Structure 1
Amino acid sequence: YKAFSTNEQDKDNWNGQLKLLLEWNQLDLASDEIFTNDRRWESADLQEVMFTALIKDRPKFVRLFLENGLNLQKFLTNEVLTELFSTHFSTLVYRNLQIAKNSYNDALLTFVWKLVANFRRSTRHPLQALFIWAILQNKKELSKVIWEQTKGCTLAALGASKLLKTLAKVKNDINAAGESEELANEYETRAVELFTECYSNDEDLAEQLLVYSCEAWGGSNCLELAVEATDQHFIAQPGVQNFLSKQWYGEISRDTKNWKIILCLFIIPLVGCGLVSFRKKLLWYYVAFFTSPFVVFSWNVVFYIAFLLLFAYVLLMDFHSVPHTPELILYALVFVLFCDEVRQWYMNGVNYFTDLWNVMDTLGLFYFIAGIVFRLHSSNKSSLYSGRVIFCLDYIIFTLRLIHIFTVSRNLGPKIIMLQRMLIDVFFFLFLFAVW
């Protein structure tokens, strides 16, 4: 640098000095020597140097350029981005991405794969695309630098964590997978800490941001990405739990005692008096009370218990060939349950079919309708017996559904989770026992 500075022709050419320093990665020297208020620094003049720094993994120089009057939004033109994705995107990483796409597919990885294909063969959020490019190549410092410029910072961190995890689940190579996994953990920690600070500073704005769907980052909000990636640590934080509790209690104030709510549920006229103490005329009070999710859940629990009791009674004591009124009531109620399941199928149909317990309930309904059809043919005694048997199986499945309900209560929900966890291992132990 000294020799080039004293040349009688490079003194005026500061661009050459900057290029040389970038090539040799001399930050402090460049900051102290060339970046001075002697001459203006236009973005167009610095665009080529910024591109060169991006290519050659020079994060500190990228940060320095961003500080000194560089507009990153304008720099990221479509041609630049497509060329960067096409030429400088390693083929090994592309092969790994193909392997992940073909083997471990996800609602998010498909989006980034489509974006990469679109830019590679030939946007709305150039910063997100650049962040994805940096992440996919396990560039830590550059990804961190780009992250600070993004708008959906916590959402971007959640998406990056999920993408890195699903990428590290690959097994083509080990070192790259481990690097991606540690980077994902780092970004998850960053998001958790940032949202903790955000919620501590304020509450309503934090909740609004958390529920903020945004405009097609990955087609999902922060909460959806966190749950999809199974980021239990993030979703178990006090702020998110408080938001969920507010949603659960609805308009009802969260600090009201439980037995008060239950008594007001059983005694309708008491709600207007005031013991329930909503957070915010009498008609509004009643509609707010009965629109609360907690009240709806309690009513549903009572209705389901009554339904199971009536099912037991009718199936056990009232299975005559001739139709009888309790059986007709039970048929009507099962049709209402079928309509509820149809509604559930409309929303998140893919999840509705994928879910094991949802599939269990749907199979229970199908078996019930089959048994009901069987009972209709009263000419055959065997048909009557088979209908009774199928009804018994339907009843036990409905009991399993009732058990599924109980998970709400904090007292015993963890116990149900633990039983579910232990069942698998006890099954294997009993299998070894059985064989020997």
Structure 2
Amino acid sequence: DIQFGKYIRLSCETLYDLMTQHWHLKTPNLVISVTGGAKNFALKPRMRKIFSRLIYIAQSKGAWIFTGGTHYGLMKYIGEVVRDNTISENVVAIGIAAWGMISNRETDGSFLLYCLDNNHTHLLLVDAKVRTQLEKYISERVIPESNYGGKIPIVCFAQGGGKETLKSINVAIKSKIPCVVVEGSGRIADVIASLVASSCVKESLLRFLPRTISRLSEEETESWIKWIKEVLESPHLLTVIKIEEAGDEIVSNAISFALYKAFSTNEHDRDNWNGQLKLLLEWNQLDLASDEIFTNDRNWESADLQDVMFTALVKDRPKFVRLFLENGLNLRKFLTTEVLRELYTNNFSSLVFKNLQIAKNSYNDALLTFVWKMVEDFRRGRHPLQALFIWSVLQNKKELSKVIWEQTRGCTLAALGASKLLKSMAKVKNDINAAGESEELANEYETRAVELFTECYSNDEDLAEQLLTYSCEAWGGSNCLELAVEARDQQFIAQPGVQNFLSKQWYGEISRDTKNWKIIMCLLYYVSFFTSPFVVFSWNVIFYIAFLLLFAYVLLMDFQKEPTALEIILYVLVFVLLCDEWYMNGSKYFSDLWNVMDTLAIFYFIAGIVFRLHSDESSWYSGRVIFCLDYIVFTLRLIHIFTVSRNLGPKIIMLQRMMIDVFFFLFLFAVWMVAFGVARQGILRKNEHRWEWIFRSVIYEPYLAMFGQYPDDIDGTTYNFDRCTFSGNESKPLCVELDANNQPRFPEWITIPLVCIYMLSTNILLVNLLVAMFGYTVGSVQENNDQVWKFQRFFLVQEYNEILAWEAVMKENYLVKINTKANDSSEEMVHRFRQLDAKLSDLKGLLKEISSKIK
């Protein structure tokens, strides 16, 4: 080993055997920087980006990287990047160096005319040919579990040219599958890029590398031209990263293109197309694969594609999924019990499994248990497309989720169900980013459903409502509207279509928007009018008002010792209301505040009855008091009742947003009251031994002070001794502490300013501040209150084959519109000027051809 690491230090295949077993595992891929590192290299940003991306790709694919390791120029930076990435599959950077250029040489030795690069994990010493032989052997190596038809595909990268670089390029080319890649910028790489005649070669070589040539002799430059001719013989192996290119993932595209060309040109793998498709699936190359394979319609029946298809689903390659579907694939036939079982058993993450467990145990829902039992049924060993969509969405595969959703028949229903599932999963929170992504995707699906329903309603208003009323068809327990409600989809229910449907339903058979007052005046043809929810609500309101009137009359005018029949009728009416609430008890009765309040009122009423029937004065008086207190709740129920006014409901709902401001106001007021009351009471009175008066003079009087009442016992002139009592044997406050002369003792210049400040703070400043806060609050949350009221309107109202094909047609039109929507804008011309240069190039080629013709 070495200190700054094993060094074989062998002289010029056998090394690979030891390397495979002793040190590290075998390579799915390998990469080589054939070009050496100059003493001074131009490290401009583009080079840094290219090589950082190359190293990241190598880590992603897990390939060895070969470099000189002299610690000069490029290799220094590559080693630094490799070290930084490894510290933060794994990358391995093997290096080779000749003893000639090593400055210090020692035999667990430590190291201080080139200096070895520190970042390289392994280094080799020789007493360049060994590199070529090793590359040839690694290429010749045969592995069965290879998608490249074995041979361990190799790619060689060239950054800067030179004598050694050209020799390495030539020797690599002589061997097959070199897959050399040359970048745009370089001393000699630019020559090769430009070429893809002795005079033209000489011109290019001189212009790109002027100075070095003059030193070289004529024979040597002729030999170099011969070498370049040999390289230029076969252009298919060469690949160039053009300078003008500035997009992302350029390195991956270049590597994939070079490897695909090398594989295709084998002349014995050409017949096989599955290998090429798999290779183009490993690297994200959609356009190239589509153009080369699927366009020709050559040799595939589309039946075997299933295999490749499966891989895509597990490798998150949605574009290839879409390509397979477009070119012919029956997802219904492809999806089988065995395929789904394989997908759920192994490819399904166990983190999502335990998350499903926790979500189900924490809360019970129909759809959660449905999906849970479905996944258990699949794992242990009927709309399979829905199962695939659920699998895709659960794992948070955004693009594949959309691609799969495009196939489902229940478009809007599927979107709403996916949104509900995502929200339920987000309820179980363990990571911030996971919950954020879940809620973002749920919102996106909600918006998509809203747009789809807008189109549905626009095309056919009468039948679009049938979709909402239409059942699941085995999709889930609830239908579209209930599913939206469960997920709290304020956006979906707040749109004009759903509100119009709710209004039309609530008005009932009565012609909509005839007139509001005519229906009130009106209070088989009659049955339709009498069965509308509007009329039932009106009757209930009238009955409740009459009940309140009767309750008040019994409470005030006629409340005798022995219950009268009228009070018995009142009891019957209240118990009838209790029976009515028994129906609503089925739902989340204790979830809402008004329900618990009504239960409390009923309990108080029955307790008051118990006191009423005792027939004792002290008991039935308390019963009357109980009834009086219950009347307050019974009357205040009208606020809840009248939330459907369309004019008062929003304002009533707005009250829920003022609680924070009210609490702040009360906090400040209470603090000031306590301080001022304690101060005054201590200042201008002696010891008090009556608890009630302590709170009556510390809390009550300052509380009244805000209502314009001014304290009286603060000024000697104003203070009157008639009210006060010297001793505690009375029911009026204790007298002010006196002096030996029998006069008030308080200074009178301490209390008055204190009261002035307190009154200024309470009466004026605090209330104005509260008004300002209320104004800002009503201004800020005006729009959201409308959505909240519309959402609650659903509950308030509900308190009292061909369609499928038409939906499919509308959805197909919508999909065709959206897919081509990006092309509709067509605000980009670079795409289009790109077309122009081809004509100029062809014209220049024809001009050169005709020039050759004449001469």
TM tier, shorter chain?
0.7 to 0.9
**Per-residue deviation, 1:298:** 1.0
Deviation track 1:149-197 (CA, whole Å, cap 9, x = no partner) reads: 1111111111222222333344421122222222122111111111011
* 8 Å Cα contact 1:375/1:384 also seen in 2: yes
**Which residue does 2:598 correspond to in 1?**
361
| Pairing 1:143–2:401 present | yes
**Per-residue deviation, 1:141:** 0.8
Kindly report structure 1 stretches of 4+ aligned residues shifted beyond 6 Å: none
| Pairing 1:158–2:395 present | no
**Which residue does 2:532 correspond to in 1?**
292
* 8 Å Cα contact 1:41/1:68 also seen in 2: no
**Which residue does 1:310 correspond to in 2?**
550
**Which residue does 1:30 correspond to in 2?**
289
Residue 427 of structure 1 is aligned with which of 644, 663, 676? 663
Residue 371 of structure 1 is aligned with which of 605, 608, 611? 608
Residue 276 of structure 2 is aligned with which of 12, 17, 38? 17
Could you list the runs of 5+ residues in structure 2 that have no partner in the other structure? Answer: 1-259, 673-855
* 8 Å Cα contact 2:416/2:449 also seen in 1: yes
* 8 Å Cα contact 2:470/2:479 also seen in 1: yes
- Cα distance in 1 for partners of 2:358, 2:655 equals 36
**Which residue does 2:456 correspond to in 1?**
198
**Which residue does 2:565 correspond to in 1?**
325
- Cα distance in 2 for partners of 1:401, 1:316 equals 21
- Cα distance in 2 for partners of 1:408, 1:321 equals 41
Percent identity over paired residues: 85
Deviation track 1:343-389 (CA, whole Å, cap 9, x = no partner) reads: 222xxx242232221222122223222322332222x3333133223
| Pairing 1:74–2:333 present | yes
User: Which 10-residue stretch deviates more, 391-400 or 406-415?
Assistant: 391-400
Quickly say closer, same or farther: Cα 1:129–1:375, change in 2 above 3 A.
same
**Per-residue deviation, 1:125:** 2.3
Residue 127 of structure 1 is aligned with which of 371, 382, 385? 385
- Cα distance in 1 for partners of 2:609, 2:415 equals 52
User: Which 10-residue stretch deviates more, 1-10 or 138-147?
Assistant: 1-10
| Pairing 1:167–2:167 present | no
* 8 Å Cα contact 1:96/1:172 also seen in 2: no
Quickly say closer, same or farther: Cα 1:359–1:424, change in 2 above 3 A.
farther
- Cα distance in 1 for partners of 2:306, 2:661 equals 60
Could you list the runs of 5+ residues in structure 1 that have no partner in the other structure? Answer: 266-283
Residue identity opposite 1:79 in structure 2: E
* 8 Å Cα contact 1:235/1:241 also seen in 2: yes
**Per-residue deviation, 1:406:** 0.9
* 8 Å Cα contact 1:168/1:181 also seen in 2: yes
**Which residue does 1:4 correspond to in 2?**
263
- Cα distance in 2 for partners of 1:126, 1:314 equals 66
Residue 335 of structure 1 is aligned with which of 567, 575, 580? 575
**Per-residue deviation, 1:425:** 4.2
**Which residue does 2:498 correspond to in 1?**
240
| Pairing 1:259–2:517 present | yes
Residue 51 of structure 1 is aligned with which of 296, 303, 310? 310
SS in 2 for 1:352: coil
Deviation track 1:365-423 (CA, whole Å, cap 9, x = no partner) reads: 23222322332222x33331332232223222211222211111111111111123323
**Which residue does 1:401 correspond to in 2?**
637
Residue identity opposite 1:415 in structure 2: K
Quickly say closer, same or farther: Cα 1:433–1:405, change in 2 above 3 A.
same
* 8 Å Cα contact 2:472/2:480 also seen in 1: no
* 8 Å Cα contact 2:278/2:308 also seen in 1: yes
Aligned length in residues: 412
SS in 1 for 2:588: helix
| Pairing 1:224–2:224 present | no
SS in 1 for 2:514: coil
**Per-residue deviation, 1:104:** 6.1
**Per-residue deviation, 1:432:** 4.8
**Which residue does 1:65 correspond to in 2?**
324
- Cα distance in 2 for partners of 1:157, 1:391 equals 52
- Cα distance in 2 for partners of 1:423, 1:195 equals 37
Quickly say closer, same or farther: Cα 1:14–1:360, change in 2 above 3 A.
same
Residue identity opposite 2:306 in structure 1: Q
Residue identity opposite 2:600 in structure 1: L
* 8 Å Cα contact 1:161/1:187 also seen in 2: yes
**Higher-RCO chain (CA-CA 8 Å, sequence separation at least 6):** 1
* 8 Å Cα contact 1:59/1:142 also seen in 2: yes
Residue identity opposite 1:203 in structure 2: E
- Cα distance in 2 for partners of 1:359, 1:114 equals 35
**Per-residue deviation, 1:291:** 0.8
**Per-residue deviation, 1:55:** 0.5
- Cα distance in 2 for partners of 1:69, 1:326 equals 80
Residue identity opposite 1:371 in structure 2: G
Residue identity opposite 2:540 in structure 1: N
**Which residue does 1:270 correspond to in 2?**
none
**Which residue does 2:699 correspond to in 1?**
none
SS in 2 for 1:351: coil
SS in 1 for 2:328: coil
Quickly say closer, same or farther: Cα 1:339–1:185, change in 2 above 3 A.
same
**Per-residue deviation, 1:293:** 1.0
Residue identity opposite 2:385 in structure 1: L
SS in 1 for 2:658: helix
**Which residue does 1:180 correspond to in 2?**
438
Quickly say closer, same or farther: Cα 1:82–1:391, change in 2 above 3 A.
farther
- Cα distance in 2 for partners of 1:230, 1:368 equals 36
Residue identity opposite 2:603 in structure 1: F
**Which residue does 1:278 correspond to in 2?**
none
Deviation track 1:11-56 (CA, whole Å, cap 9, x = no partner) reads: 332222222222223222222222133335233x121111111000
Higher helix share: 1
- Cα distance in 2 for partners of 1:41, 1:365 equals 75
Structure with bigger gyration radius = 2
- Cα distance in 2 for partners of 1:200, 1:368 equals 53
Quickly say closer, same or farther: Cα 1:40–1:205, change in 2 above 3 A.
farther
User: Map of 1:404-415 to 2, 5 A cutoff?
Assistant: 404-415=640-651
> RMSD in angstroms over aligned alpha carbons?
2.2
SS in 1 for 2:473: coil
- Cα distance in 2 for partners of 1:131, 1:386 equals 64
**Which residue does 1:39 correspond to in 2?**
299
**Per-residue deviation, 1:105:** 5.9
SS in 1 for 2:435: helix
Please give the TM-score of this superposition, normalised by the length of structure 1: 0.88
Quickly say closer, same or farther: Cα 1:111–1:383, change in 2 above 3 A.
farther
Residue identity opposite 2:589 in structure 1: Y
